[PDB]
Amino acid sequence: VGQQYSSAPLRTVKEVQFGLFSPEEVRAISVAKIRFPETMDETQTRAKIGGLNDPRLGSIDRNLKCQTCQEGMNECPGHFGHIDLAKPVFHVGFIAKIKKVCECVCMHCGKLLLDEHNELMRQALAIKDSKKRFAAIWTLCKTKMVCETDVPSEDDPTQLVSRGGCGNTQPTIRKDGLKLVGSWKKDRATGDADEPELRVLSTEEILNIFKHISVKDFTSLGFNEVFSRPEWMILTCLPVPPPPVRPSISFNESQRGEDDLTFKLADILKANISLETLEHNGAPHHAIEEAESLLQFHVATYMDNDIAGQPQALQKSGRPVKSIRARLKGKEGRI
Protein backbone atom coordinates (compact mmCIF):
# COMPACT_ATOMS: atom_id res chain seq x y z
CA VAL A 1 0.00 0.00 0.00
CA GLY A 2 2.97 2.28 0.63
CA GLN A 3 6.31 2.16 -1.17
CA GLN A 4 9.78 0.61 -1.52
CA TYR A 5 10.59 -3.05 -2.16
CA SER A 6 10.55 -6.44 -0.46
CA SER A 7 12.12 -9.66 -1.69
CA ALA A 8 9.49 -11.16 0.63
CA PRO A 9 6.37 -12.72 -0.93
CA LEU A 10 3.09 -10.89 -0.36
CA ARG A 11 0.45 -13.06 1.31
CA THR A 12 -2.87 -13.11 3.13
CA VAL A 13 -3.57 -14.39 6.66
CA LYS A 14 -5.43 -17.71 6.57
CA GLU A 15 -5.27 -19.20 10.10
CA VAL A 16 -4.62 -17.51 13.45
CA GLN A 17 -3.14 -19.27 16.48
CA PHE A 18 -3.81 -17.96 19.95
CA GLY A 19 -1.36 -18.67 22.72
CA LEU A 20 0.60 -17.17 25.58
CA PHE A 21 4.17 -15.95 25.54
CA SER A 22 6.60 -18.30 27.24
CA PRO A 23 9.16 -16.58 29.45
CA GLU A 24 11.82 -17.98 27.12
CA GLU A 25 10.07 -16.65 24.03
CA VAL A 26 9.61 -13.05 25.15
CA ARG A 27 13.39 -12.93 25.65
CA ALA A 28 14.20 -14.50 22.30
CA ILE A 29 11.96 -11.94 20.57
CA SER A 30 12.78 -8.82 22.61
CA VAL A 31 15.42 -6.36 21.40
CA ALA A 32 15.58 -4.05 24.41
CA LYS A 33 16.63 -4.85 27.98
CA ILE A 34 14.97 -1.96 29.82
CA ARG A 35 16.55 -0.98 33.13
CA PHE A 36 15.87 2.76 33.46
CA PRO A 37 12.35 4.14 34.07
CA GLU A 38 13.70 7.32 32.46
CA THR A 39 13.14 8.12 28.80
CA MET A 40 15.06 10.65 26.70
CA ASP A 41 17.32 12.63 29.04
CA GLU A 42 21.05 12.21 29.72
CA THR A 43 22.20 15.37 31.50
CA GLN A 44 19.56 17.40 29.61
CA THR A 45 21.05 16.42 26.23
CA ARG A 46 18.06 15.01 24.41
CA ALA A 47 18.29 11.44 23.18
CA LYS A 48 17.15 8.35 25.08
CA ILE A 49 18.62 5.95 27.65
CA GLY A 50 19.34 2.24 27.53
CA GLY A 51 16.21 2.11 29.68
CA LEU A 52 12.85 2.62 27.97
CA ASN A 53 11.98 3.59 24.38
CA ASP A 54 15.44 3.63 22.76
CA PRO A 55 17.84 0.63 22.84
CA ARG A 56 16.77 -1.20 19.70
CA LEU A 57 13.16 0.02 19.62
CA GLY A 58 11.94 2.63 17.14
CA SER A 59 12.71 6.34 17.33
CA ILE A 60 11.24 9.84 17.29
CA ASP A 61 12.27 13.25 15.85
CA ARG A 62 12.03 11.74 12.35
CA ASN A 63 15.23 9.70 12.66
CA LEU A 64 15.61 6.70 10.35
CA LYS A 65 17.41 4.61 12.97
CA CYS A 66 15.84 1.50 14.48
CA GLN A 67 17.34 -1.99 14.82
CA THR A 68 19.17 -1.45 11.53
CA CYS A 69 15.70 -1.65 9.92
CA GLN A 70 15.55 2.07 9.07
CA GLU A 71 12.30 3.58 7.71
CA GLY A 72 11.37 5.83 10.64
CA MET A 73 8.20 6.97 12.41
CA ASN A 74 6.09 5.17 9.82
CA GLU A 75 6.49 1.83 8.06
CA CYS A 76 7.91 0.57 11.34
CA PRO A 77 6.48 -2.53 12.95
CA GLY A 78 7.34 -1.31 16.44
CA HIS A 79 9.82 -3.73 17.98
CA PHE A 80 9.23 -5.35 21.35
CA GLY A 81 11.21 -4.84 24.53
CA HIS A 82 12.37 -7.04 27.40
CA ILE A 83 12.34 -6.79 31.20
CA ASP A 84 12.90 -9.39 33.92
CA LEU A 85 10.61 -9.35 36.96
CA ALA A 86 12.05 -10.19 40.39
CA LYS A 87 9.60 -12.58 42.06
CA PRO A 88 7.04 -14.03 39.58
CA VAL A 89 3.89 -11.92 39.28
CA PHE A 90 0.34 -12.81 38.22
CA HIS A 91 -1.54 -11.76 35.08
CA VAL A 92 -4.78 -9.98 36.08
CA GLY A 93 -7.01 -11.39 33.34
CA PHE A 94 -6.10 -14.99 34.17
CA ILE A 95 -6.30 -15.00 37.97
CA ALA A 96 -9.82 -16.44 37.86
CA LYS A 97 -8.40 -19.13 35.56
CA ILE A 98 -5.43 -19.89 37.80
CA LYS A 99 -7.79 -20.58 40.72
CA LYS A 100 -10.10 -22.84 38.74
CA VAL A 101 -6.94 -24.72 37.79
CA CYS A 102 -5.46 -24.88 41.31
CA GLU A 103 -8.77 -26.36 42.48
CA CYS A 104 -8.45 -29.11 39.84
CA VAL A 105 -4.92 -30.29 40.57
CA CYS A 106 -3.43 -31.54 43.82
CA MET A 107 -0.85 -29.23 45.38
CA HIS A 108 2.69 -30.67 45.66
CA CYS A 109 2.47 -33.40 43.00
CA GLY A 110 0.52 -31.53 40.31
CA LYS A 111 -1.75 -34.40 39.33
CA LEU A 112 -5.43 -34.21 38.40
CA LEU A 113 -7.59 -34.67 41.47
CA LEU A 114 -9.56 -37.26 39.52
CA ASP A 115 -8.39 -40.04 37.23
CA GLU A 116 -9.90 -42.52 34.77
CA HIS A 117 -10.70 -44.79 37.71
CA ASN A 118 -13.58 -42.39 38.45
CA GLU A 119 -16.43 -43.22 36.08
CA LEU A 120 -18.04 -39.77 36.43
CA MET A 121 -14.73 -38.15 35.52
CA ARG A 122 -14.46 -40.35 32.41
CA GLN A 123 -17.56 -38.72 30.95
CA ALA A 124 -16.07 -35.24 31.44
CA LEU A 125 -12.80 -36.38 29.81
CA ALA A 126 -14.46 -37.71 26.65
CA ILE A 127 -16.01 -34.29 26.04
CA LYS A 128 -13.93 -32.74 23.24
CA ASP A 129 -14.38 -29.02 24.01
CA SER A 130 -12.03 -26.84 26.08
CA LYS A 131 -14.87 -24.82 27.66
CA LYS A 132 -16.80 -27.99 28.42
CA ARG A 133 -13.92 -30.19 29.66
CA PHE A 134 -12.30 -27.57 31.87
CA ALA A 135 -15.82 -26.87 33.10
CA ALA A 136 -16.91 -30.50 33.46
CA ILE A 137 -13.74 -31.48 35.36
CA TRP A 138 -13.67 -28.49 37.70
CA THR A 139 -17.26 -28.89 38.92
CA LEU A 140 -16.69 -32.64 39.32
CA CYS A 141 -13.39 -32.73 41.23
CA LYS A 142 -13.23 -29.32 42.97
CA THR A 143 -15.04 -31.27 45.74
CA LYS A 144 -12.29 -33.72 46.69
CA MET A 145 -9.75 -32.14 49.01
CA VAL A 146 -7.57 -35.20 49.48
CA CYS A 147 -5.27 -36.53 46.76
CA GLU A 148 -6.23 -40.21 46.75
CA THR A 149 -3.48 -42.85 46.83
CA ASP A 150 -5.89 -45.71 46.10
CA VAL A 151 -9.36 -45.87 44.51
CA PRO A 152 -11.82 -48.83 44.23
CA SER A 153 -11.07 -50.70 40.98
CA GLU A 154 -13.53 -51.33 38.14
CA ASP A 155 -14.19 -54.68 39.82
CA ASP A 156 -14.87 -55.59 43.45
CA PRO A 157 -14.81 -52.53 45.71
CA THR A 158 -12.93 -54.92 48.04
CA GLN A 159 -9.59 -54.40 46.27
CA LEU A 160 -8.17 -50.87 45.93
CA VAL A 161 -5.87 -49.64 43.16
CA SER A 162 -2.78 -47.52 43.78
CA ARG A 163 -2.47 -44.16 42.00
CA GLY A 164 -0.83 -40.75 42.54
CA GLY A 165 0.77 -41.12 45.95
CA CYS A 166 0.29 -38.21 48.35
CA GLY A 167 -2.79 -38.36 50.54
CA ASN A 168 -1.98 -34.74 51.44
CA THR A 169 -5.02 -32.55 52.06
CA GLN A 170 -6.08 -29.92 49.53
CA PRO A 171 -6.72 -26.28 50.49
CA THR A 172 -9.95 -24.35 50.02
CA ILE A 173 -9.01 -21.34 47.90
CA ARG A 174 -10.66 -17.94 48.10
CA LYS A 175 -9.65 -14.92 46.00
CA ASP A 176 -8.70 -11.77 47.91
CA GLY A 177 -7.79 -8.85 45.70
CA LEU A 178 -4.64 -9.76 43.77
CA LYS A 179 -3.72 -12.81 45.88
CA LEU A 180 -4.89 -16.37 46.50
CA VAL A 181 -5.67 -17.64 50.00
CA GLY A 182 -6.38 -21.24 50.98
CA SER A 183 -7.47 -23.16 54.10
CA TRP A 184 -6.55 -26.68 55.31
CA LYS A 185 -7.83 -29.33 57.74
CA LYS A 186 -7.62 -33.09 58.47
CA ASP A 187 -11.24 -34.02 57.62
CA ARG A 188 -14.37 -32.01 58.44
CA ALA A 189 -14.82 -32.08 62.22
CA THR A 190 -13.03 -35.41 62.73
CA GLY A 191 -11.29 -36.11 66.04
CA ASP A 192 -7.95 -34.37 66.67
CA ALA A 193 -8.13 -32.55 63.34
CA ASP A 194 -10.60 -29.66 63.61
CA GLU A 195 -9.81 -25.97 63.00
CA PRO A 196 -8.42 -24.82 59.61
CA GLU A 197 -5.16 -23.03 58.77
CA LEU A 198 -4.71 -19.92 56.61
CA ARG A 199 -1.56 -19.09 54.64
CA VAL A 200 -1.08 -17.23 51.33
CA LEU A 201 -0.43 -19.24 48.16
CA SER A 202 2.50 -17.32 46.65
CA THR A 203 3.51 -17.22 43.00
CA GLU A 204 6.44 -19.58 43.44
CA GLU A 205 4.11 -22.23 44.89
CA ILE A 206 1.77 -21.79 41.94
CA LEU A 207 4.69 -22.11 39.49
CA ASN A 208 5.92 -25.49 40.74
CA ILE A 209 2.39 -26.90 40.65
CA PHE A 210 1.78 -25.60 37.11
CA LYS A 211 5.26 -26.66 35.96
CA HIS A 212 5.15 -30.19 37.35
CA ILE A 213 1.78 -31.00 35.77
CA SER A 214 2.22 -33.33 32.77
CA VAL A 215 0.95 -32.88 29.22
CA LYS A 216 -1.86 -35.44 29.52
CA ASP A 217 -3.16 -33.22 32.32
CA PHE A 218 -3.07 -29.98 30.33
CA THR A 219 -4.83 -31.95 27.61
CA SER A 220 -7.86 -32.78 29.73
CA LEU A 221 -7.73 -29.04 30.41
CA GLY A 222 -7.61 -26.28 27.81
CA PHE A 223 -3.88 -26.21 27.06
CA ASN A 224 -1.71 -27.23 24.11
CA GLU A 225 1.76 -27.72 25.61
CA VAL A 226 3.03 -25.78 22.59
CA PHE A 227 1.26 -22.43 22.45
CA SER A 228 -0.24 -22.46 25.93
CA ARG A 229 1.28 -23.92 29.11
CA PRO A 230 -0.62 -23.17 32.36
CA GLU A 231 2.70 -21.96 33.74
CA TRP A 232 2.53 -19.11 31.23
CA MET A 233 -0.59 -17.63 32.86
CA ILE A 234 1.88 -16.28 35.42
CA LEU A 235 4.34 -13.57 34.35
CA THR A 236 8.10 -14.03 34.59
CA CYS A 237 9.25 -11.87 31.72
CA LEU A 238 7.35 -8.67 30.82
CA PRO A 239 7.10 -8.11 27.03
CA VAL A 240 7.64 -4.40 26.39
CA PRO A 241 5.35 -2.71 23.85
CA PRO A 242 7.23 -0.55 21.26
CA PRO A 243 6.83 3.29 20.97
CA PRO A 244 4.04 3.30 18.33
CA VAL A 245 1.88 1.60 20.96
CA ARG A 246 2.49 4.38 23.49
CA PRO A 247 3.24 7.56 21.46
CA SER A 248 4.88 10.59 23.07
CA ILE A 249 2.74 13.72 22.62
CA SER A 250 4.88 16.57 21.24
CA PHE A 251 4.03 20.18 20.33
CA ASN A 252 6.76 21.83 18.22
CA GLU A 253 10.02 21.21 20.04
CA SER A 254 10.48 20.86 23.81
CA GLN A 255 7.14 19.89 25.36
CA ARG A 256 6.44 16.84 27.56
CA GLY A 257 3.61 14.34 27.22
CA GLU A 258 4.34 10.61 27.21
CA ASP A 259 1.45 8.12 27.08
CA ASP A 260 -0.14 6.84 30.28
CA LEU A 261 1.26 3.44 29.27
CA THR A 262 4.87 4.58 29.61
CA PHE A 263 3.97 5.83 33.09
CA LYS A 264 2.64 2.48 34.31
CA LEU A 265 5.83 0.93 32.93
CA ALA A 266 7.99 3.26 35.00
CA ASP A 267 5.95 2.11 38.00
CA ILE A 268 6.48 -1.52 37.03
CA LEU A 269 10.18 -0.89 36.47
CA LYS A 270 10.53 0.99 39.76
CA ALA A 271 8.29 -1.47 41.66
CA ASN A 272 10.74 -4.01 40.26
CA ILE A 273 13.93 -2.07 40.98
CA SER A 274 13.22 -1.50 44.69
CA LEU A 275 12.39 -5.20 44.83
CA GLU A 276 15.74 -6.43 43.45
CA THR A 277 17.54 -3.93 45.68
CA LEU A 278 16.03 -5.31 48.91
CA GLU A 279 16.61 -9.02 48.26
CA HIS A 280 20.24 -8.14 47.44
CA ASN A 281 21.44 -5.50 49.93
CA GLY A 282 19.35 -5.94 53.07
CA ALA A 283 16.55 -8.50 53.25
CA PRO A 284 14.17 -7.72 56.17
CA HIS A 285 12.35 -11.00 55.36
CA HIS A 286 8.56 -10.57 55.31
CA ALA A 287 9.12 -6.81 55.10
CA ILE A 288 9.87 -7.15 51.39
CA GLU A 289 6.58 -8.77 50.36
CA GLU A 290 5.09 -5.26 50.47
CA ALA A 291 7.14 -4.11 47.46
CA GLU A 292 6.20 -7.42 45.85
CA SER A 293 2.47 -6.74 46.08
CA LEU A 294 3.29 -3.36 44.49
CA LEU A 295 4.80 -4.88 41.36
CA GLN A 296 1.89 -7.35 41.43
CA PHE A 297 -0.28 -4.23 41.43
CA HIS A 298 1.45 -2.18 38.72
CA VAL A 299 1.54 -5.19 36.40
CA ALA A 300 -2.15 -5.73 37.06
CA THR A 301 -2.73 -1.98 36.86
CA TYR A 302 -0.76 -1.61 33.61
CA MET A 303 -3.08 -4.18 32.02
CA ASP A 304 -6.50 -3.53 33.56
CA ASN A 305 -8.39 -1.33 36.04
CA ASP A 306 -11.28 -3.01 37.84
CA ILE A 307 -10.28 -3.91 41.41
CA ALA A 308 -10.83 -2.35 44.85
CA GLY A 309 -8.16 0.25 44.16
CA GLN A 310 -7.90 2.37 41.02
CA PRO A 311 -4.33 3.60 40.26
CA GLN A 312 -5.08 6.83 38.42
CA ALA A 313 -1.85 8.47 39.65
CA LEU A 314 0.28 9.61 36.67
CA GLN A 315 1.16 13.32 36.59
CA LYS A 316 -2.38 14.45 37.42
CA SER A 317 -3.95 15.54 40.69
CA GLY A 318 -7.13 14.69 38.83
CA ARG A 319 -6.83 10.89 38.67
CA PRO A 320 -7.16 9.38 35.11
CA VAL A 321 -6.52 5.85 33.75
CA LYS A 322 -5.63 3.88 30.60
CA SER A 323 -4.62 0.23 30.94
CA ILE A 324 -4.98 -2.10 27.97
CA ARG A 325 -8.39 -3.72 28.40
CA ALA A 326 -9.38 -0.06 28.28
CA ARG A 327 -7.63 0.31 24.94
CA LEU A 328 -8.82 -2.95 23.42
CA LYS A 329 -12.43 -2.20 24.40
CA GLY A 330 -12.22 1.19 22.73
CA LYS A 331 -10.95 -0.50 19.56
CA GLU A 332 -13.12 -3.65 19.84
CA GLY A 333 -16.14 -1.41 20.19
CA ARG A 334 -14.93 0.86 17.38
CA ILE A 335 -14.49 -2.05 14.97
Contact positions toward another protein, by CB under 8 A? 1-2, 4-21, 25-26, 28-29, 67-71, 75, 77-80, 91, 93-94, 97, 130-131, 134, 222-224, 226-228, 232-233, 235, 239-242, 244-245, 303, 324-325, 327-329, 331-335
Binding flag, residue 299, Zn ion (CB under 5 A): no
Taking CB under 5 A as the binding criterion, the range among 100-108, 135-143, 223-231, 250-258 that sits at the site for Zn ion is: 100-108
Q: Is 69 annotated as a binding residue?
A: yes
Looking at beta carbons only, is 131 or 280 nearer to another protein? 131
Window 165-194: residues binding Zn ion (CB under 5 A): 166
Residue 290, Cβ neighbours under 10 Å: how many?
A: 11
Complex with another protein: residue 14 or 188, whichever CB lies closer: 14
Task: Point out which span in 164-172, 179-187, 208-216, 325-333 binds Zn ion (CB under 5 A).
Answer: 164-172
CB 144 within 8 A of CB 113: yes
CA atoms 91, 96, 99, 101: torsion sign: negative
Residue 280 marked in a binding site: no
Residue 29: contacted member of Zn ion, another protein, none (CB under 5 to 8 Å, by partner type): another protein
- Angle between helices 203-212 and 95-102 in degrees, nearest 10: 60
Among 131, 109, 99, which residue's Cα sits nearest to residue 213? 109
From the number of C-beta atoms within 10 Å of its C-beta (0-12, 13-18, 19+), residue 248 rates as middle
Min CB(99)–another protein separation in Å: 13
- From another protein, Zn ion, none, which one binds at residue 191 (CB under 5 to 8 Å depending on kind)? none
- Concatenating the DSSP letter of every residue in 51-67 gives SSS-SSS--STT---ST
At 45, phi and psi to the nearest 5?
-45, 115
We find the least distance from the C-beta atom of residue 108 to another protein, in angstroms, to be 24
Q: Report the nearest approach of another protein to the CB of residue 80 (Å).
A: 7
**What are the phi and psi torsion angles at 94 (to 5°)?**
-110, -10
Comparing CB distances to Zn ion, the nearer of 69 and 127 is: 69
166 annotated as ligand-binding: yes
The whole-angstrom separation of Cα 182 and Cα 165 is 22
Cα distance between residue 295 and residue 41, in whole Å: 25
Q: How many residues bind Zn ion (CB under 5 A)?
A: 8
Residue 109 assigned as binding residue: yes
Q: Binding residue per annotation — 104? A: no
Residue type, 233: M
Smallest gap, in angstroms, from Cβ of residue 184 to another protein? 28
Q: Exposed, middle or buried by CB within 10 Å (0-12, 13-18, 19+), for 198?
A: exposed
Q: Which of another protein, Zn ion, none does residue 166 bind (CB under 5 to 8 Å by kind)?
A: Zn ion
Task: Confirm or deny that 106 is annotated as ligand binding.
Answer: yes
Of 286, 287, 293, which Cα lies nearest the Cα of 86? 293
Known binding-site residue numbers: 66, 69, 76, 79, 106, 109, 147, 166
| Binding positions for Zn(2+) | 66, 69, 76, 79, 106, 109, 147, 166
